[PDB]
């Protein structure tokens, strides 16, 4: 099968910056090649047929070179609703195969998260369970560290974290970390604390909530 | 011009048989083009399956010869797809596709808007949906956030809204996290502070494997 390459796995731009990405063919592929689009959450578009002809709807920004082996796309004048996963499909030989995929990820200036903890609802508590939740909205860059304290004691397990893709409007990423307790453990403690450590502060941001108030 | 529409169960047992039909309008299959069916698994990583041709003619993806299936129906302008003997590895978004059959005149691919399947031996469950309100002692600020907690549900997917959707800025949903064979994922909406409770605001959750819908409003804890 023909192996088709993608470079680079990922990065970053600035808007309004000129982007370009790599596919390579292990054999010439006489520019049956197609470039696909990806945006976060949402389905597969073609956006470029023969190497370098354009889908009608997509914008003249976008545009396809290369041959043989070696094949390119370029943006330019990259725009907020660009960034997602592209792929290159070779229709050339069966079986059809596609590269690996380039993900776009549009850089910006940094931005502190804004942390809000949800205590467990009435509801939830009927049931045995108990989850604390901590919104960790916002943010800029992704990485970021979350940590839970118990009456003041760090709590490891029992803690799932997941963060969004970079949002489409503000390039902002946001996570959430929920810990989940029994009723039985929830109600042996006073104190539930989540703390965010993100490289816009040197201290964390602390959000609290006590269960005698 | 065209349009594709992938369907069929988004829940298969391991072993058995996976199908899914493509329903096309606004182009005959039997005129031109060829039929496909592709897939990408979680990871993002993408596989041509196969096509049946607008002549009936087929062309399987070597790695699946043995377990693989793509027929039509003319009268129904409809092609199909059967995975046989299924793992969890089969778990993918199924996507429905045309392609050019000939080299000239020169045809774009164009892909249907995606199906997911999962496959296991777990059982459908609805989620409960839980409130996520701010502790009375917490703080009014300018904007409040609050949010839904999605909680025990199989298979993925979900879709959570705000106020039916009309809520849409200031709204995100977290990626679900999977445990012990059931999801858990939260929906945040962030709006002004002079807006709730007086202006009330309730998450939409719909679980389509389950035909669930379930509406909570948000009620401060006092």
Redesign the interface.
């Given at each position: 099968q023909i192996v088709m390459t993608q470079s680079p796995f990922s990065m970053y731009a600035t808007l309004g910056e000129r982007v370009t990405i790599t596919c390579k063919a292990s054999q010439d592929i006489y520019s049956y090649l197609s470039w696909l689009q990806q945006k976060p959450g949402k389905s597969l578009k073609t956006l470029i047929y023969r190497a370098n002809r354009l889908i009608t709807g997509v914008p003249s920004r976008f545009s396809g070179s290369g041959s043989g082996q070696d094949y390119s796309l370029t943006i330019s004048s990259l725009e907020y609703e660009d960034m997602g996963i592209y792929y290159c499909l070779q229709y050339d030989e069966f079986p059809y195969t596609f590269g690996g995929g380039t993900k776009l990820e549009m850089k910006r200036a940094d931005a502190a998260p804004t942390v809000s903890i949800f205590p467990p609802s009435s509801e939830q508590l009927t049931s045995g369970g108990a989850s604390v939740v901590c919104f960790l909205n916002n943010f800029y860059p992704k990485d970021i560290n979350v940590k839970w304290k118990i009456d003041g004691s760090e709590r490891q397990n029992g803690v799932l974290n997941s963060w969004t893709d970079q949002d489409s409007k503000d390039s902002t990423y946001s996570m959430s970390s929920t810990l989940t307790l029994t009723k039985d453990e929830y109600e042996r403690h006073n104190s539930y604390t989540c703390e965010a450590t993100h490289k816009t502060s040197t201290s964390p941001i602390v959000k609290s909530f006590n269960r005698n108030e | 011009e065209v349009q594709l529409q992938e369907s069929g169960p988004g829940l298969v047992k391991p072993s058995q048989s996976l199908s899914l039909t493509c329903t096309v309008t606004g182009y005959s299959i039997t005129s031109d083009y060829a039929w496909n069916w592709?897939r990408?698994f979680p990871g993002?990583?993408?596989?041509?399956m196969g096509y049946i041709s607008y002549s009936g003619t087929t062309?399987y993806?070597?790695?699946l010869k043995s377990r693989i299936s793509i027929t039509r129906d003319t009268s129904k302008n409809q092609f199909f797809l059967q995975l046989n003997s299924v793992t969890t590895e089969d778990t993918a978004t199924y996507?429905c596709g045309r392609?050019?059959v000939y080299?000239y005149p020169?045809?774009?691919?164009?892909?249907?808007?995606?199906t997911l399947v999962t496959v296991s031996a777990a059982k459908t469950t609805p989620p409960?949906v839980?409130?996520?309100?701010?502790?009375s002692?917490?703080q009014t600020n300018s904007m409040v956030?609050l949010?839904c907690?999605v909680?025990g549900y199989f298979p993925e997917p979900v879709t959570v809204t705000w106020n039916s959707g009309s809520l849409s800025?200031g709204v995100?949903?977290?990626?679900?996290?999977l445990?012990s064979d059931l999801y858990?994922?939260?929906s945040?909406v962030?709006v002004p502070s002079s807006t709730w409770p007086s202006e009330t605001v309730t998450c939409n959750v719909a679980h389509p494997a389950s035909s669930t819908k379930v509406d909570k409003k948000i009620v401060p804890?006092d």
């Open positions: - | 592709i990408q993002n990583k993408l596989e041509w062309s993806n070597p790695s996507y392609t050019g080299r020169e045809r774009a691919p164009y892909w249907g808007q995606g409960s839980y409130p996520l309100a701010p502790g002692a917490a956030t949010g907690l909680k800025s995100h949903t977290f990626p679900a996290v445990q858990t994922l939260s945040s962030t804890r």
